[PDB]
């Protein structure tokens, strides 16, 4: 869980970030609230334009799924009723997969969730709470649950998991499970053991994120 | 050092105390609970302020959101019957400036402004689900208006925090450091726009370069010394 | 007229009979679901009422206070649909406010009213702009003081407004009005749907039981 | 209206001067004066209302049962008990559907220790003895939203209040976001208010345990609100204002509608010939000619599955699929339609 992030790296965007876990590096940018296109307009709430760009080649249907899952996480996080008939552009440029993209998209999704959240924080957009996402995997010979697995570990995995939780009260109370994307062969006992260990490492991540956010933003503010 | 807060954290103040909610603080229409939605430093006004305490969160932002009683710098971009279409900030929703509200206003009388002009304007009304309205003369102004066209000069992009500090904080040395070198006028907008003019372009340019450098570093100490190197470089020719 | 299908002949344009030593003239008028079509047969032309819909044939006739008897021949559905009952001038409709700007209030038609009630619902999607959009001008909001009308205090985004059609307008927007007692905001929630249910206590005021907050609107007379 | 009480405890001005026929002025007509108007103006407030003090929480709801008071004896015991307090909380329930002016159906009274529920129907002619305590100025009487209740005590029971503290004025003076009484219960007692019981007439007995429970909770909530008002108001320099408002609420005397003052104040409550028939006849003929002249399904491939009637299934405890009756769907629909239409009509907002 030795992640590293930077905040406010882009000039022509309201907010930006660069999240790095292992070899997975994703840069994200957020502009909003701004004027929306007519087809995007929502009478009462904020409209989200979510874009995911791959590390190699052009955006395909694969990234279209990454956009969809990332939408399921960011939508309830943002206090959308504060910005009626308005738009918020959220762009993720995956710079380095950190995994075999022909087989997995686990680490890229988690890194996009964490980066998007950080970019939303930087942009100063109304959020109902905080959030953290981690990738998890299981190995058949080992029987182990490995949090933040490497690319080599994924190759020999039986199941891959993306867990993103919603935290409140100083990152101590799990408000809800924003996203759990479990793929592969697994049983009910493995699922809850995954959720128990997953919640712990997620809570540790929020604490680390809270540290990063305060370290970067506080110099900008005044005492 | 300050007491930082994050969205979804517990709100310190007790419901038994009447609290006026400012920026960053949100009152849920469904559960009636008061909760912070922005990330930054929580500021709570001292008690005794007419029995009402004002609590808000100072958070970093650069995308302006129109609020009533704000002095802003807009650019005319449009013509509509009964008003000007003015843009506070790029890609943001346009604001309206009625033909009615001007310094020596008349319904018959009309403004001479031409699309592309900078206006020092006050935002009297900012409905959340409706286009922003900007007025050059305000009833609050009560017969005194600083509102109107800005001629020539140079405009500068600046984050909302830096602009707010430049407008409301008198301890901000930026104006002073620029006064000990040359004399010029400045318009300050809460929408993150700063208008600077001098008699000579080289001085306005020097001011432009200083404000950006000081906005970038955000180190209060640097500017007087930072300004000194900037003034010198212009004469380098 | 047991059965009606599109293209089936119903009756000639005129009819007659003999009652009480006097000949009564029946003037058949093409109503909704029918149309006068000129056919040819035996060399001589002929105009006959033809059903254009599938359903049970119905007729109506009437004299009002404000020998030939005028009969109205029509065809009703036999077995919901917003097709045959498309919004025309004078019709009352239920629409939802999509956007507000100072100049006008904009709503999309969701359903249509009928005379003694019942309703017709548009099956179109509001997500794809498939619904017929309309416009309520500021001077068509209410009847009294139409010069000084604040839109923000009459409607809100998401409000369900019962309005009446003034004209078809262009292909983009219908033109509606709410300048009657039984017209205006009918269904609404506090804070644009972020709050609880609000009922029309006053004709100009909306009140909510749990919220404890009152928001003004141009509501229909309760 | 002729006041119903011949006994006036805690009196500063004999009941005599109280029973005085006033003349008819231009502003208002003749009518009896509020009997305790004097004492409400003169009698000193208990000096303990005046100090900021640590708050006393409500008793835990479950350490006690509400005390039902419907005999003269229970009432007298209750009276002896209230005589021992320094403050009490009071509320009423009023019914106006099956009565012209209305009748007082219940009285709720709480001490720091216990909650009382008084059958004001059975004890209508008995309740005046509470004037001992209700007009004792050294015992605070805490009401929320009592401006009407003051009138009704008068009208029905002949009861008056000297030493009133109204938490509604307290809430306003403090500038709280919601005046509502439940708000206090919701935030301080962690108790969720229920609307439905009030709307239906409260006359029916025995009273429902749920229907008892809200009243039991409500008095405690009111007491808590009063406590909140007492210390913050003192702190805020606003207590004097609330006692003034409270005396104005207490001061007013109910009057008959005919006798009500002229200026309504908050002090008092009260052509076709052309086509031939023959020519048309020919039309009927040619039509009959035209009309007269005009005069199994099996599925090869997708005919079987595409137009399949909608069926529903419900898995039981054993995990076996059960076909919902085609009939069942219709029955729910009829019932659902019934439920909304009957259901829709009634709603009361306070």
């Amino acid at each position: 869980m030795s992640v590293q992030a930077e905040i406010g790296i882009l000039d022509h965007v309201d907010g930006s970030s660069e999240f790095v876990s292992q070899d997975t590096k994703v840069i994200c940018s957020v502009t909003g609230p701004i004027e929306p296109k007519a087809r995007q307009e929502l009478p009462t709430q904020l409209a989200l334009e979510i874009i995911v760009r791959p590390a190699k080649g052009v955006a395909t249907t694969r990234e279209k799924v990454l956009e969809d899952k990332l939408r399921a996480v960011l939508t309830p996080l943002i206090t959308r009723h504060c910005y009626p008939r308005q738009l918020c552009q959220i762009t993720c440029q995956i710079l380095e997969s950190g995994e075999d993209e022909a087989e997995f998209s686990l680490r890229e999704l988690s890194c996009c969730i964490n980066a998007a959240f950080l970019a939303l924080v930087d942009a100063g957009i109304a959020l109902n709470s905080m959030c953290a996402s981690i990738p998890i995997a299981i190995i058949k010979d080992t029987s182990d649950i490995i949090v933040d697995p490497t690319a080599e570990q994924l190759k020999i995995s039986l199941s891959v998991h993306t867990l993103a939780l919603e935290f409140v009260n100083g990152g101590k109370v799990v408000k809800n499970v924003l996203l759990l994307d479990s793929n592969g062969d697994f049983n009910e006992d493995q699922l809850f053991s995954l959720l128990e260990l997953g919640e712990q490492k997620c809570q540790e991540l929020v604490t680390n994120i809270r540290r990063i956010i305060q370290d970067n933003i506080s110099p900008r503010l005044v005492v | 050092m300050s007491t930082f807060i994050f969205p979804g954290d517990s709100f310190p103040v007790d419901p038994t105390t009447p609290v006026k909610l400012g920026p960053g603080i949100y009152c849920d229409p469904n559960t009636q609970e008061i909760r912070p939605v922005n990330t930054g430093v929580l500021h709570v006004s001292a008690k005794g302020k007419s029995g009402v305490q004002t609590a808000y969160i100072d958070y970093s932002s650069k995308r302006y959101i129109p609020s009533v009683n704000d002095f802003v710098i807009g650019v005319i971009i449009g013509t509509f019957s009964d008003s000007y279409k003015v843009s506070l900030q790029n890609f943001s929703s346009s604001v309206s400036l009625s033909y009615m509200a001007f310094p020596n206003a008349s319904k018959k009388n009309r403004p001479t402004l031409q699309v592309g002009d900078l206006v020092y304007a006050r935002v009297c009304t900012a409905e959340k689900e409706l286009e922003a309205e900007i007025e050059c003369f305000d009833s609050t102004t009560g017969r005194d208006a600083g509102f109107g066209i800005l001629e020539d000069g140079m405009i500068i992009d600046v984050n909302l925090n830096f602009a707010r500090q430049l407008l409301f904080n008198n301890d901000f040395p930026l104006l002073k450091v620029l006064a000990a070198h040359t004399k010029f006028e400045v318009a300050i907008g809460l929408n993150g726009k700063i208008w600077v003019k001098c008699e000579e372009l080289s001085n306005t340019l020097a001011c432009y370069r200083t404000i950006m450098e000081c906005c970038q570093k955000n180190d209060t100490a640097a500017f007087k010394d930072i300004a000194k190197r900037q003034f010198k470089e212009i004469l380098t020719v | 007229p047991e059965i009606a299908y599109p293209g089936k002949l119903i009756c000639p344009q005129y009819g007659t009979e003999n009652k009480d030593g006097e000949d009564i003239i029946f003037n058949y008028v093409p109503g909704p679901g029918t149309k006068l079509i000129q056919y040819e047969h035996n060399g001589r032309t002929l105009e006959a009422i033809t059903a254009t819909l599938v359903g049970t044939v119905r007729c109506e006739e009437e004299k009002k206070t404000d020998t030939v008897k005028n009969i109205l021949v029509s065809v009703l559905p036999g077995t919901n649909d917003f097709a045959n009952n498309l919004p025309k001038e004078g019709d009352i409709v239920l629409t939802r406010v999509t956007r507000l700007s100072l100049q006008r209030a904009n709503v999309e038609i969701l359903a249509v009213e009928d005379k003694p009630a019942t309703f017709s619902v548009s099956q179109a999607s509001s997500d794809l702009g498939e619904t017929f959009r309309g416009i309520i001008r500021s001077q068509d909001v209410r009847s009294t003081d139409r010069d000084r009308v604040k839109v923000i205090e009459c409607f809100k985004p998401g409000d369900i407004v019962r309005a009446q059609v003034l004209s078809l307008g262009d292909g983009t927007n219908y033109y509606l009005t709410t300048a009657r007692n039984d017209l205006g905001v009918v269904f609404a929630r506090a804070a644009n749907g972020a709050g609880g249910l609000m009922y029309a206590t006053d004709w100009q005021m909306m009140t909510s039981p749990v919220t404890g907050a009152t928001e003004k609107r141009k509501c229909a007379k309760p | 209206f002729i006041p119903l009480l011949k006994e006036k405890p805690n009196a500063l001005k004999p009941l005599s001067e109280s029973l005085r026929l006033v003349d008819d002025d231009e502003n208002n007509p003749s009518h009896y004066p509020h009997p305790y108007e004097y004492e409400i103006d003169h009698q000193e407030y208990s000096p303990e209302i005046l100090q900021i003090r640590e708050e006393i929480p409500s008793k835990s709801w479950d350490d006690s049962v509400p005390i039902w008071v419907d005999t003269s004896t229970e009432l007298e015991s209750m009276l002896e008990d209230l005589k021992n307090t320094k403050e009490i909380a009071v509320d009423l329930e009023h019914h106006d559907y099956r009565s012209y002016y209305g009748i007082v159906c219940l009285m709720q009274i709480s001490t720091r220790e216990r909650d009382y529920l008084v059958d004001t129907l059975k004890l209508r002619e008995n309740l005046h003895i509470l004037n001992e305590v209700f007009t004792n100025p050294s015992i605070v009487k805490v009401f929320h939203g009592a401006f009407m209740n003051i009138i009704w005590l008068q009208r029905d029971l002949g009861l008056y209040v000297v030493g009133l503290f109204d938490t509604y004025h307290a809430s306003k003076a403090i500038g709280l976001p919601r005046h509502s009484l439940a708000y206090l219960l919701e935030n301080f007692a962690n108790f969720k208010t229920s609307k439905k019981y009030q709307l239906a007439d409260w006359r029916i007995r025995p009273l429902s345990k749920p229907m008892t429970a809200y009243a039991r909770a409500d008095t405690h909530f009111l007491l808590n609100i009063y406590d909140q008002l007492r210390n913050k108001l003192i702190e805020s320099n606003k207590l004097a204002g609330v006692l003034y408002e409270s005396r104005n609420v207490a001061k007013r005397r109910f009057e008959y509608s005919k006798y009500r003052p002229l200026t309504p104040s908050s002090e008092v409550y009260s052509l076709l010939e052309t086509i031939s028939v023959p020519q048309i006849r020919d039309v009927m003929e040619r039509f009959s000619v035209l009309c007269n002249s005009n005069i199994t399904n099996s599925s090869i491939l997708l005919g079987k599955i595409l137009p399949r009637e909608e069926h529903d299934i419900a898995y039981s405890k054993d995990g076996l699929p059960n076909k919902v009756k085609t009939e069942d769907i219709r029955i729910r629909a009829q019932n659902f339609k019934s439920a909304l239409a009957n259901l829709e009509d009634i709603i009361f907002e306070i």
Side-chain angles (χ1 to χ4, degrees), chain A residues 1-84 86-139 141-223, chain B residues 2-46 48 50-107 109-137 139-140 142 145-146 148 150-198 200-223 225-237, chain C residues 1-18 21-61 65 67-132 134-146 149-206 208-217 219-220 222, chain D residues 3 9 11 14 29 33 35 47 57 66 89 102 137 145-146 158 163 170 173 175 177 182 189 200 206 210 213 215 217 240-241 250 261 264 272-316 318-342 345-346:
Chain A
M1 295 299 302
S2 64
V3 302
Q4 51 185 20
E6 296 180 1
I7 304 298
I9 59 185
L10 300 180
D11 303 336
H12 300 71
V13 188
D14 294 334
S16 62
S17 72
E18 186 183 7
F19 198 89
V20 178
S21 180
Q22 186 173 355
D23 284 338
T24 304
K25 172 159 61 180
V26 172
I27 182 183
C28 182
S29 68
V30 163
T31 302
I34 58 175
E35 177 72 28
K37 295 183 177 299
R39 55 171 185 84
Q40 297 175 329
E41 290 188 8
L42 300 182
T44 70
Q45 310 181 40
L46 175 71
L48 291 317
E49 179 175 347
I50 303 174
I51 311 168
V52 170
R53 294 293 183 85
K56 300 175 184 177
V58 302
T60 62
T61 56
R62 171 177 178 264
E63 290 75 23
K64 219 61 185 174
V65 163
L66 290 182
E67 291 173 4
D68 190 90
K69 296 181 179 176
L70 183 57
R71 177 174 296 269
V73 178
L74 300 184
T75 304
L77 279 177
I78 310 177
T79 321
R80 306 169 63 199
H81 280 90
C82 183
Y83 318 100
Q86 294 300 320
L87 179 70
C88 174
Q89 289 182 324
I90 311 176
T91 303
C92 289
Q93 174 61 81
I94 310 174
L95 295 172
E96 183 65 13
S97 305
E99 56 184 353
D100 199 331
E101 59 273 354
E103 298 179 336
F104 309 99
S105 68
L106 203 69
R107 322 196 75 259
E108 301 174 75
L109 176 60
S110 296
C111 191
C112 277
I113 295 176
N114 293 326
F117 172 79
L118 286 175
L120 286 177
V121 170
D122 192 34
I125 305 188
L127 301 177
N128 299 324
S129 45
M130 294 196 65
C131 183
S133 180
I134 59 177
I136 294 169
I138 297 171
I139 295 100
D141 289 345
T142 299
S143 178
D144 184 1
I145 301 181
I146 294 169
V147 181
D148 192 35
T150 67
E152 293 177 350
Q153 290 180 297
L154 289 181
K155 301 178 62 179
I156 56 180
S157 65
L158 177 63
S159 70
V160 296
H161 310 261
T162 295
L163 180 59
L165 302 179
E166 178 174 17
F167 288 84
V168 290
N169 192 31
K172 303 181 185 304
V173 179
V174 176
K175 183 176 182 301
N176 202 3
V177 45
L178 296 176
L179 176 66
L180 175 58
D181 187 33
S182 295
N183 289 284
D185 192 37
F186 59 88
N187 61 83
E188 182 170 338
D189 297 334
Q190 283 182 310
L191 177 58
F192 288 103
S193 299
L194 182 91
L195 262 53
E196 183 178 2
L197 295 174
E199 293 177 350
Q200 293 177 335
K201 258 56 185 60
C202 273
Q203 198 280 330
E204 296 178 0
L205 184 56
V206 180
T207 301
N208 192 16
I209 289 181
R210 289 172 66 99
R211 180 189 60 89
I212 298 184
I213 295 184
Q214 185 169 355
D215 281 331
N216 296 25
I217 296 185
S218 53
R220 310 182 194 175
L221 308 177
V222 77
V223 294
Chain B
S2 60
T3 59
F4 214 66
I5 191 170
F6 298 83
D9 288 17
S10 178
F11 192 60
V13 199
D14 56 331
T16 66
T17 300
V19 178
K20 182 191 302 179
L21 306 188
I25 307 297
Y26 182 77
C27 178
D28 196 307
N30 194 30
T31 55
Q32 296 296 330
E33 64 173 0
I34 282 79
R35 55 179 221 265
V37 293
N38 283 112
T39 59
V41 180
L42 177 62
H43 294 258
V44 176
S45 62
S50 301
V52 177
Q53 286 185 310
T54 301
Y56 76 97
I57 303 177
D58 182 28
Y59 62 95
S60 178
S61 176
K62 56 200 302 181
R63 179 61 55 179
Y64 179 72
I65 302 175
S67 64
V68 296
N69 290 280
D70 281 28
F71 296 162
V72 297
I73 296 183
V75 63
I76 303 301
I77 67 181
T79 59
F80 177 80
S81 295
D82 289 345
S83 61
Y84 288 105
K85 299 296 183 181
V86 63
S87 178
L88 295 174
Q89 189 170 1
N90 289 337
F91 324 119
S92 293
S93 300
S94 64
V95 187
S96 67
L97 172 59
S98 181
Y99 296 138
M100 261 180 256
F102 297 90
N104 192 31
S106 193
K107 63 181 183 180
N109 192 31
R110 170 188 178 273
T112 59
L113 299 177
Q114 281 168 19
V115 168
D117 282 329
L118 295 174
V119 281
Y120 198 63
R122 189 193 79 98
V123 175
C124 55
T125 76
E127 295 302 320
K128 189 183 57 179
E129 52 279 338
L130 177 63
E131 293 177 350
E133 274 188 3
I134 61 171
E135 293 177 350
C136 295
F137 177 80
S139 64
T140 201
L150 301 169
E151 296 276 12
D152 184 1
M154 180 57 181
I155 200 175
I156 304 180
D157 286 329
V158 296
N159 67 88
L160 299 189
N161 304 94
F162 187 86
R164 291 177 64 84
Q165 282 286 325
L166 199 66
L167 186 71
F168 290 147
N169 194 338
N170 195 23
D171 285 90
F172 219 83
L174 184 59
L175 297 194
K176 178 184 183 58
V177 295
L178 288 177
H181 300 111
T182 202
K183 304 278 194 192
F184 59 88
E185 295 167 352
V186 53
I188 301 173
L190 283 180
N191 55 319
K193 296 291 191 300
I194 303 171
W195 178 76
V196 181
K197 151 198 224 178
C198 295
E200 298 176 2
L201 188 147
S202 64
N203 293 328
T204 305
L205 175 61
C207 290
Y208 177 89
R209 298 175 176 183
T210 51
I211 298 187
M212 301 267 319
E213 183 65 13
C214 293
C215 177
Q216 179 65 28
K217 298 292 180 65
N218 192 31
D219 184 1
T220 59
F223 308 162
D225 289 345
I226 303 301
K228 295 180 182 297
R229 182 182 65 198
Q230 294 300 140
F231 296 97
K232 183 190 183 69
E233 190 176 1
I234 299 304
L235 300 177
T236 299
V237 58
Chain C
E2 293 179 346
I3 303 301
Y5 61 81
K8 184 180 183 182
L9 303 185
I10 301 183
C11 65
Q13 188 173 357
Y14 301 105
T16 299
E17 63 171 359
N18 180 268
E22 185 178 0
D23 299 328
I24 314 177
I25 294 169
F26 294 146
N27 173 80
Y28 295 93
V29 178
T34 61
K35 183 177 182 180
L36 256 180
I37 303 182
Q38 176 181 344
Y39 301 90
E40 293 177 350
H41 182 62
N42 266 331
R44 301 152 303 185
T45 61
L46 179 64
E47 298 191 10
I49 304 297
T50 306
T52 66
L53 291 182
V54 175
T56 64
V57 182
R58 181 177 181 170
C59 295
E60 293 177 350
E61 63 185 342
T65 59
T67 60
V68 296
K69 294 183 179 179
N70 300 274
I71 294 169
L72 182 67
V73 180
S74 61
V75 171
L76 295 174
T79 57
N80 296 132
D81 289 345
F82 189 92
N84 197 85
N85 192 31
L86 177 63
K88 194 56 189 61
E89 170 181 348
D91 296 332
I92 305 180
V93 175
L94 299 172
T95 59
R96 173 173 34 209
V97 180
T98 54
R99 217 196 150 168
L100 277 145
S101 208
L102 177 63
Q103 294 300 320
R104 66 184 182 277
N106 300 265
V107 311
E108 50 162 9
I109 287 86
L110 297 179
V112 175
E113 293 177 350
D114 181 65
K115 43 189 67 184
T118 51
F119 294 89
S120 274
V121 296
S122 176
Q123 293 177 335
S125 64
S126 302
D127 313 84
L128 177 63
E130 195 171 336
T131 55
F132 294 95
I135 288 182
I136 304 176
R137 304 181 302 179
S138 57
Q139 63 266 27
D140 296 277
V141 176
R142 56 178 183 264
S143 180
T144 64
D145 198 337
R146 317 193 314 172
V149 175
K150 293 185 178 181
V151 187
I152 197 56
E153 303 181 5
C154 297
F155 308 112
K156 283 297 238 78
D159 288 344
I160 308 296
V161 176
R162 181 179 180 274
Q164 187 181 17
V165 181
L166 290 174
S167 64
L168 301 183
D170 50 327
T172 305
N173 295 120
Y174 272 93
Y175 281 88
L176 314 177
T177 182
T178 49
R180 294 183 181 277
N181 282 334
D182 56 333
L183 300 181
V185 179
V186 168
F187 177 81
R189 290 188 174 94
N192 309 328
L197 295 178
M198 297 190 308
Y199 300 88
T201 299
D202 289 345
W203 60 92
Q204 196 57 221
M205 294 300 293
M206 241 160 196
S208 181
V210 177
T211 59
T214 62
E215 303 168 341
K216 309 169 157 184
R217 315 285 170 96
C219 300
Chain D
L272 295 174
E273 152 191 14
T274 59
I275 303 301
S276 74
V277 175
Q279 293 177 335
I280 294 169
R281 185 182 295 276
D282 159 50
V283 171
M284 296 173 61
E285 170 64 9
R286 303 181 305 178
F287 177 82
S288 298
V289 170
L290 175 61
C291 192
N292 271 281
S293 61
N294 289 337
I295 209 182
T296 59
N297 198 44
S298 41
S299 295
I300 325 293
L301 183 67
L302 306 173
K304 277 177 183 178
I305 191 66
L306 264 53
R308 175 62 60 89
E309 49 183 10
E310 63 185 342
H311 290 292
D312 300 327
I313 61 178
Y315 293 90
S316 301
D318 44 27
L320 298 179
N322 300 118
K323 172 185 176 180
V324 177
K325 293 179 179 179
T326 48
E327 295 85 357
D328 181 65
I329 61 171
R330 294 183 181 277
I331 294 170
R332 301 162 160 181
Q334 282 278 351
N335 163 43
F336 176 75
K337 254 140 202 213
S338 64
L340 177 63
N342 289 337
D345 285 343
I346 294 169

